Amino acid sequence: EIQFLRTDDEVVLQCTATIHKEQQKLCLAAEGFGNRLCFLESTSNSKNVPPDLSICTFVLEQSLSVRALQEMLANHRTLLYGHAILLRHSYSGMYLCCLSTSRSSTDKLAFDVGLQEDTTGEACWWTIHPASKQRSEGEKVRVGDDLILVSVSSERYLHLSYGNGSLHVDAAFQQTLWSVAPISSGSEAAQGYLIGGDVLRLLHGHMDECLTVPSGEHGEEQRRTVHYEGGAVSVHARSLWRLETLRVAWSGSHIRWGQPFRLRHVTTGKYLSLMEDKNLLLMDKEKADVKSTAFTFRSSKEKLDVGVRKEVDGMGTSEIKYGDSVCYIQHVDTGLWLTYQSVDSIQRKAIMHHEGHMDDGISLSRSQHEESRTARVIWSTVFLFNRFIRGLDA
Amino acid sequence: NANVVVRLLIRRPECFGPALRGEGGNGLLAAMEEAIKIAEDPSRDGPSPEEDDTIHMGNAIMTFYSALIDLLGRCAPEMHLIHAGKGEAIRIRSILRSLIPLGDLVGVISIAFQMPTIAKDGNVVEPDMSAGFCPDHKAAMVLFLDRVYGIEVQDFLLHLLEVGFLPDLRAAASLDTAALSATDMALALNRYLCTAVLPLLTRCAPLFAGTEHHASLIDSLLHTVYRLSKGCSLTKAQRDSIEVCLLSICGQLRPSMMQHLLRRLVFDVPLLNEHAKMPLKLLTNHYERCWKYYCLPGGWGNFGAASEEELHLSRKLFWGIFDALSQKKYEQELFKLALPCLSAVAGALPPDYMESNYVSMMEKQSSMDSEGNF
């Protein structure tokens, strides 16, 4: 009845902000390539700006006692308060650590928290301590607990820095309460079934034309449209979409029919959306609203409403199967069905219709981990290099 | 008890004082300078509306920070544990290094005192000890710098010697006058130098080997220490500490660098007073170690050979000591320490050495005159 955080469970670390008398939920984020530092991702404004939990998810590898960790350094377990945990960043495969090099954020004593490759050393390990007097050392850690983390290397708490103009995460002697939210459990996952946060391809028809954007015409504004294309694009990275749920906790659970989600184009970093002029157009993270960017998978064209379903706090039941299942995309608000305009590789436009054609069903194909990683690498690299080019041009 | 205290103090960082709180704190050196300014200003120093009730707030702040630094330095782990590689000891040292930068310690050491002066009437005007900056404050800085950061680099040693240690030694050597010898500043400075600075330089003697490029700072240090040793008010323990420091440094120094000190010794040793006790041993050790530099024409291959001016000085020293012993009444320890020096000098000097008719021009022994030394 009560859930315990266990090893090999994918979680995110949350912190609360009280800037100008409001509660702002923030998540610890870091991207492996490029900046090794850690920054904060806002999850409170989920309705206005989608959060990027893909770089916020962490996994619990090992939970050893302090004595065992000291002995090892000299040379599905359940987390217990007072043990030392090892956090691996899911996207990068690198571990959280104290960098021992400070950015001098007006705090001379503070250190910087980043990502490190090797496991050896006392920097990667963090001790978990009860933040509430109800809990005590040795007790099992509940999922809905506030956790205070202390660096083994420097005895500096994972600290949220209000003092600087921007919010920072750092290792400081002051303490900040962190809440751990269970994103997903790897063991409970079922093969061949769609879960939240999967990079996938939307295949259409017998010809298997995949929903993609225009190719690299060097036009960031021309790449904003959406169309069906067949051929090598099904192997290319411009047809990869990431399915993101609207919930932060248990965002890695099994996707069910009637569950709203956002489709994010991996290489461009833009979210699928419907125009007021009833056209499908990609916009940016800042202006991707839920009203515009929410979509649903429906089993049939039937007009019966899915109603409201109690969101289960778990991995859920497998309901959508890769390849086998046939799905229909419907906008949450307008209720319109995604369809092909059928006007004339094939280059048939994707238009958003009240009724649509009878053959509007799609198939879902999961993408390899290497392929997804390469696509996000492409996005993050093109972003930085475009910034470099703009600066040089200025 | 050290690991617990360090963790408690880092759990509550307000214990470190406003300078080291960390939320925009100015720093230890800036805190010391602000304390100087406060102790100088009358308004912030005193209550400004029984005499012991007067709290000099500048000195109070100075003492607080010095005590904090001393406590942390004492909390630093012992050297042998770090050499063994205890992770907890290494971590504690790292925490202390993070808390206190080395630059702040160097700056606070570099801060200079205000020396007492004699007035028109001859009555020396004395700064009050209960106010202002005291050498005991620098004693804690040296303790921390030795027990936490450690001096293991010749470059760092020379930089410290140039910036902070030498000026205080010069001040002590200049305050060796008869009237100013017994003053509180002189006694405190002697107690600081003979218990914090000089033992540090004695333990860091091997770093003095390769100092060819810095050939002037070493000579300044030797002369200043020798003058401080010739000082009068020094106690037996202080004198012994100075003797040990000088004997340790001179042993590691190159043969050529001791020429300037030899020039002073050949003018003071022939007196054979009690003060010659240490010069006799220093000469014996020098001429026992560097005998090849003088006797063999090649000398030490790397070091070289004498310039014949050193040979002239050595012969003059030998003959002066011989004559003074000849006309000196028999003293047991004085004779049994003078004989080894005479033997060592005789062995070092080449038997067939040429006495140069070219006497030196303007031998400036009167420059370091007996009274006033200048």
Swiss-Prot record, chain A:
Induction: By TGFB1. Residues 76-131, 138-183, 191-246, 252-309, 317-367 form the MIR domain. It comes from the Eukaryota. Channel activity is modulated by phosphorylation. Phosphorylation is increased in failing heart, leading to calcium leaks and increased cytoplasmic Ca(2+) levels. It is found in: Sarcoplasmic reticulum membrane. Detected in heart muscle (at protein level). Heart muscle, brain (cerebellum and hippocampus) and placenta. It is linked to Ventricular tachycardia, catecholaminergic polymorphic, 1, with or without atrial dysfunction and/or dilated cardiomyopathy: An arrhythmogenic disorder characterized by stress-induced, bidirectional ventricular tachycardia that may degenerate into cardiac arrest and cause sudden death. Patients present with recurrent syncope, seizures, or sudden death after physical activity or emotional stress. CPVT1 inheritance is autosomal dominant. Ventricular arrhythmias due to cardiac ryanodine receptor calcium release deficiency syndrome: An autosomal dominant arrhythmogenic disorder characterized by syncope, cardiac arrest and/or sudden unexpected death, often in association with physical exertion or acute emotional stress. Patients who survive manifest polymorphic ventricular tachycardia and ventricular fibrillation. Unlike typical catecholaminergic ventricular tachycardia, arrhythmias are not reproducible on exercise stress testing or adrenaline challenge. Cytosolic calcium-activated calcium channel that mediates the release of Ca(2+) from the sarcoplasmic reticulum into the cytosol and thereby plays a key role in triggering cardiac muscle contraction. Aberrant channel activation can lead to cardiac arrhythmia. In cardiac myocytes, calcium release is triggered by increased Ca(2+) cytosolic levels due to activation of the L-type calcium channel CACNA1C. The calcium channel activity is modulated by formation of heterotetramers with RYR3. Required for cellular calcium ion homeostasis. Required for embryonic heart development. Homotetramer. Can also form heterotetramers with RYR1 and RYR3. Interacts with FKBP1A and FKBP1B; these interactions may stabilize the channel in its closed state and prevent Ca(2+) leaks. Interacts with CALM and S100A1; these interactions regulate channel activity. Identified in a complex composed of RYR2, FKBP1B, PKA catalytic subunit, PRKAR2A, AKAP6, and the protein phosphatases PP2A and PP1. Interacts directly with FKBP1B, PKA, PP1 and PP2A. Interacts with SELENON. In cardiac muscles, identified in a complex, composed of FSD2, CMYA5 and RYR2. This is Ryanodine receptor 2. The gene is RYR2.
